[PDB]
Write a protein that binds this ligand. Structure first.
Ligand SMILES: [Cl-]
Ligand SMILES: [Cl-]
Ligand SMILES: [Mg+2]
Ligand SMILES: [Mg+2]
Ligand SMILES: [Mg+2]
Ligand SMILES: [Mg+2]
Ligand SMILES: [Mg+2]
Ligand SMILES: [Mg+2]
Ligand SMILES: [Mg+2]
Ligand SMILES: [Mg+2]
Ligand SMILES: [Mg+2]
Ligand code: NA
Ligand code: NA
Ligand code: NA
Ligand code: NA
Ligand code: NA
Ligand code: NA
Lengths: 186, 140, 95, 154, 160
RNA sequence: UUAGGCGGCCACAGCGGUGGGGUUGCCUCCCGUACCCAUCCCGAACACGGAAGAUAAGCCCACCAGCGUUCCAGGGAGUACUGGAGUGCGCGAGCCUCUGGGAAAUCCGGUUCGCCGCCACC
RNA sequence: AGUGCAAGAGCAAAAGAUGACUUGACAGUGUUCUUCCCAACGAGGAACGCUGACGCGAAAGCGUGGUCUAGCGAACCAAUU
RNA sequence: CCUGUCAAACUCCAAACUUACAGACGCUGUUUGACGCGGGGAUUCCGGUGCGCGGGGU
């Protein structure tokens, strides 16, 4: 920018999207990466492998295509994250993928966070992924219990649109149950 | 167009650069929350050789804690034109700094895909003077 | 030479042109080679580890197995056969 | 196709240059060889440029030199039309010469020594201290220029 | 010391002052002479003294030749004559002398010289058509004090 | 790709600037602290929960060359330098011829305001 | 800028700074390069492994002392495990 | 802004050229066995000159 000697960062470094030091360490495993990414409204999970001209996504799942199986609730929460990971993991199993390493990009390794929920989901789908149980949220929170108890302090419905008043972690069970089922159109 | 352009107060940093403390107490009572010790860099002949060591204290106020402070803080000073920053800030007074900005400032403060706020979307001294002056006081 | 260390007279060969300065892309550090493949040896100034003796920069050897994550490349220094332990970060496929 | 004649001896000449002449089958002064105009051969003659005389000879000239100085791979045997006919893929010297010039074959392929051992130049040459453009005998020659030399070294 | 000792360019460039101490000051008093407040473009005539052979000119020679040239211009045009002369080269090359015999021979620092390639302008004067023969004379005296043979060349000037 | 995610090359992509774009869609800004989690002080950030509002930021789309960069034409220049050769020239430092290669600065006019891969998606 | 010390090199979501934790400055044994280009030659050094035991991290992973090139010493004898 | 100069321990640039590997042609080798391996025996470790490139030195 300033002259011939000036050093411009790699594109994905300028864009502040890729941590190259972390990426290298991730790629050292030789295993595919379980790319956990969040959005204000959604949660995405991708099984990415290394390629000659760029990364290859062999399987993925977005919290939006969760409804295709019977999801009527919001898509930016814990239950949403787990289910999106499970869905991605199941699609991964179908593609011949057996193992992966969790890539959380620029997100923080906070205990009980959504990226670990995505991780738990993928693991339950059948994927062997290096993990740590006491960094994952306790089962109830993954179900969405923390949100129901929050709506218990009602007076005004937590959800604007009508999914339900007191919310349903039971809906989470129905969906998980639907995915763990052998049939399911992946 | 206007709603996402009208200024706001991001933080009010009240600090007392002493030089060696017992002053934390007053900042706590005048602000409403806990103070923070302030270390220093580089050795100085004025018996300030110790690198990392208490010298001052500060408090960063946000939202109500900031407004509820300024309501009784601003009336204690005579704001001037020169007393204003180029980004639209101002410091008066025990120091009291007020950081002003527009709605989408988080774009430059977040971890993922951060970006620096374009000059057009940056606050101006004039635009700052107006907003504050337009709230219980006078300019010049 | 006034000294006989490994880095003697390496000012040029072990220095990056100002624009190539900074952490190198991970892609080439994770590249995989097969036994028999011809590889060019060239130290990447930005990558500290996995290097070889600077005297061998410019050699083109044959990958003949590996040791840990590093590769075992066979070269011929003058008339002598040598085995060089080196990582992918300092290797490039011939052709 | 160019005709190469060594005009300067081995003493004091670079070893890599001497080895180039040997790869081109010339091992003595006044020894001539025929070389196809390829990139590979072009580099070789350029390297030998200062101790040689070269250029494309005319059909006639080649025929005169082939008749007079060509030899079998082994032995004394004169290489005349009959010899050419009874041992080569051609009917006479002219056919062989034409083939050589059009780079369709080589002296070896036809059972002939790759070297034409010439005689010293009758009337002497133009000197081995300067190139043709300076009045000497070294370097690239005109077809007429090469012919004059080859015919004088008949 | 004779110039025969230093006139040739048979040594590496030796100018790095960060590795060389005790370098004698330059005897060259000025590089810009005459009316330095005026521009070269304000003159119709521009004559340069050109060096014909590549050489090294010691700072003592630059001063002597420059002096004998400008001193003339002053005498013929006055201490404020309408002209301006420039010595464009600076003595960058440091000189040594091995002043024990050939043991630890690396010489001590004794002076400085300017490396001038053949065909270069050592001096360039700017004057009016009237004073053209005066600057040609200053240069004649100037080339008698430097090692090489020179050419007095009239660049901008065709009142000939 | 009517705004997404992971990348490869790592400025041809930088710097700077102009215009355009979003009712249950996307990304955001945005709203908000019971929870998981968090600030040596601040739900600012990090984390979690969420849609009343907005396209002003970001982002995506279209474009401008003033600066920086890439490449190309013409000029500089077959100049500077140079591998091989010479009973060529020069008191000499050095130069010249033949042969095989061949710049840099700079000027002028173009080019360049990224290209490409995988996945997902009215 | 800083990164203990020459010089040159390397480094920016770090190899630098701050904070916290920790003792891999670990035992055993190798492969290879260097010392000694080519081309034989010891001590020493380094790179890269494995076996064992650990530290930290969500994890990939990192740690065979200090970002890299100086900081080193045979046999006999003694002390020590 | 303009104007005057430089670098063995400077570099936004940048040759000729040297060099690793591979293919091609050439040359060479398969009764003259190359390339390579193993073993016996040395001599040698005062060198000099020309040319090109040098560093020191009048
Ligand atoms: Cl994300
Ligand atoms: Cl090595
Ligand atoms: Mg060098
Ligand atoms: Mg015979
Ligand atoms: Mg006679
Ligand atoms: Mg003669
Ligand atoms: Mg807009
Ligand atoms: Mg280290
Ligand atoms: Mg003893
Ligand atoms: Mg002891
Ligand atoms: Mg060399
Ligand atoms: Na690099
Ligand atoms: Na002495
Ligand atoms: Na003279
Ligand atoms: Na403290
Ligand atoms: Na916008
Ligand atoms: Na050793």
């Amino acid at each position: 920018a300033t002259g011939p000697r000036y050093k411009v960062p790699m594109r994905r470094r300028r864009e502040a999207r890729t941590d190259y030091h972390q990426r290298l360490r991730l790629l050292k495993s030789g295993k595919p990466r379980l790319v956990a990414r969040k959005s204000n409204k959604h949660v995405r999970a991708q099984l990415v492998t290394l390629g000659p001209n760029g990364d290859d996504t062999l399987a993925s799942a977005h919290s939006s295509d969760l409804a295709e199986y019977g999801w009527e609730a919001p898509t930016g929460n814990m239950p949403s994250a787990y289910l999106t990971g499970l869905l991605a993991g199941l699609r991964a199993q179908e593609a011949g993928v057996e193992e992966a390493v969790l890539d959380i990009g620029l997100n923080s390794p906070t205990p009980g966070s959504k990226v670990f929920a995505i991780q738990e989901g993928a693991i339950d789908a059948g994927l062997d992924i290096p993990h740590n149980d006491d960094v994952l949220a306790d089962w109830q929170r993954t179900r969405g219990a923390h949100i129901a108890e929050y709506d218990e302090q009602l007076e005004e419905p937590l959800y604007s649109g009508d999914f339900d008043a007191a919310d349903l972690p039971e809906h989470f069970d129905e969906l998980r149950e639907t995915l763990l089922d052998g049939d399911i159109e992946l | 167009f206007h709603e996402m352009r009208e200024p706001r107060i991001e933080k009010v940093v009240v600090h007392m650069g002493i030089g060696h403390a017992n002053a934390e107490d007053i900042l706590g009572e005048i602000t409403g929350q806990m103070p923070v010790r302030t270390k220093a860099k580089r050795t100085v002949g004025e018996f300030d050789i110790r690198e990392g060591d208490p010298i001052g204290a500060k408090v960063t106020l946000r939202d109500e804690m900031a407004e509820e402070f300024l309501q009784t803080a601003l009336p204690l000073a005579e704001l001037a034109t020169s007393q204003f920053d180029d980004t639209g800030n101002f410091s008066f007074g025990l120091d009291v700094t007020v950081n002003l900005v527009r709605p989408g400032y988080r774009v430059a403060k977040r971890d993922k895909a951060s970006r620096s706020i374009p000059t057009k979307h940056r606050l101006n001294p004039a635009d700052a003077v107006a907003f504050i002056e337009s709230t219980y006081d006078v300019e010049v | 030479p006034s000294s006989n260390g490994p880095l003697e007279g390496t000012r040029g060969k072990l220095k990056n042109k100002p624009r190539d300065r900074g952490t190198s892309p991970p892609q080439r550090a994770v590249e995989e080679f097969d036994d028999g493949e011809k590889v060019h040896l060239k130290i990447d100034p930005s990558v500290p580890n996995g290097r070889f003796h600077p005297r061998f920069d410019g050699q083109t050897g044959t990958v003949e197995g590996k040791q840990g994550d590093a590769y075992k490349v066979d070269i011929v220094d003058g008339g002598k056969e040598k085995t060089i332990i080196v990582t992918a970060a300092h290797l490039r496929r011939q052709e | 196709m160019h005709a190469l004649v060594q005009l300067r001896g081995e003493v004091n000449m670079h070893t890599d240059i001497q080895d180039t002449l040997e790869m081109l089958n010339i091992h003595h002064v006044n020894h001539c060889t025929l070389v196809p105009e390829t990139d590979a051969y072009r580099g070789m003659v350029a390297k030998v440029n200062d101790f040689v005389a070269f250029g494309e000879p005319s059909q006639e000239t080649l025929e005169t030199v082939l008749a007079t100085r060509a030899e079998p791979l082994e032995g004394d045997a004169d290489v005349d039309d009959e010899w050419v006919a009874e041992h080569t893929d051609y009917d006479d010297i002219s056919g062989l010469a034409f083939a050589l010039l059009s780079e369709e074959t080589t002296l070896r392929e036809q059972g002939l020594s790759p070297t034409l051992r010439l005689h010293p130049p009758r009337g002497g040459h133009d000197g081995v201290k300067h190139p043709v453009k300076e009045g000497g005998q070294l370097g690239k020659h005109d077809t007429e220029g090469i012919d004059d030399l080859l015919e004088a070294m008949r | 010391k004779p110039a025969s000792m230093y006139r040739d360019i048979d040594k590496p460039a030796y100018t790095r002052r960060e590795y060389i101490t005790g370098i004698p000051g330059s005897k060259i008093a000025q590089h810009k002479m005459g009316r330095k407040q005026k521009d070269a473009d304000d003159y119709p005539v521009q004559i340069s003294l050109i060096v014909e052979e590549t050489v090294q000119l010691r700072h003592g020679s630059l001063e002597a030749s420059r002096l004998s040239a400008n001193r003339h211009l002053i005498k013929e045009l006055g201490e404020e004559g309408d002209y301006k002369m420039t010595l464009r080269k600076f003595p960058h090359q440091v000189l040594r002398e091995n002043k024990d015999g050939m043991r630890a021979a690396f010489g001590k620092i004794v002076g400085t010289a300017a490396r001038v390639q053949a065909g270069e302008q050592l001096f360039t004067a700017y004057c009016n058509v009237e004073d053209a023969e005066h600057v040609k004379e200053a240069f004649r005296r100037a080339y008698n004090k430097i090692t090489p043979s020179c050419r007095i060349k009239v660049e901008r000037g065709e009142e000939l």
